[PDB]
Amino acid sequence: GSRRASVGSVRVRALYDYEGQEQDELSFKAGDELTKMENEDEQGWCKGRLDNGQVGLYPANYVEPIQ
């Protein structure tokens, strides 16, 4: 067994740049890496962890899955 079999963290790649609007949001550029920690909401948003280490919401429509 390995961490690839788990479902509590999914690495994802930023499609485009984004900048957080509250203390519970994150900021990244086109081609950055981040970590999804929660499912997509009814609005098309997720909650994850950043390359610097911060934790917050971001639009799930600005990322794609890594394999």
Strands (E), 1-67: 10-14, 33-36, 45-49, 55-59, 63-65
Closest CA to 28 of 63, 61, 1, 3: 63
Residues with Cβ within 8 Å of residue 59, at least 6 apart in sequence = 18, 44, 45, 46
What CATH topology corresponds to 3-65?
A: SH3 type barrels. (2.30.30)
Structure determined via: NMR
Measure Cα distances from 17 to 5, 39, 43 in Å: 29, 21, 19
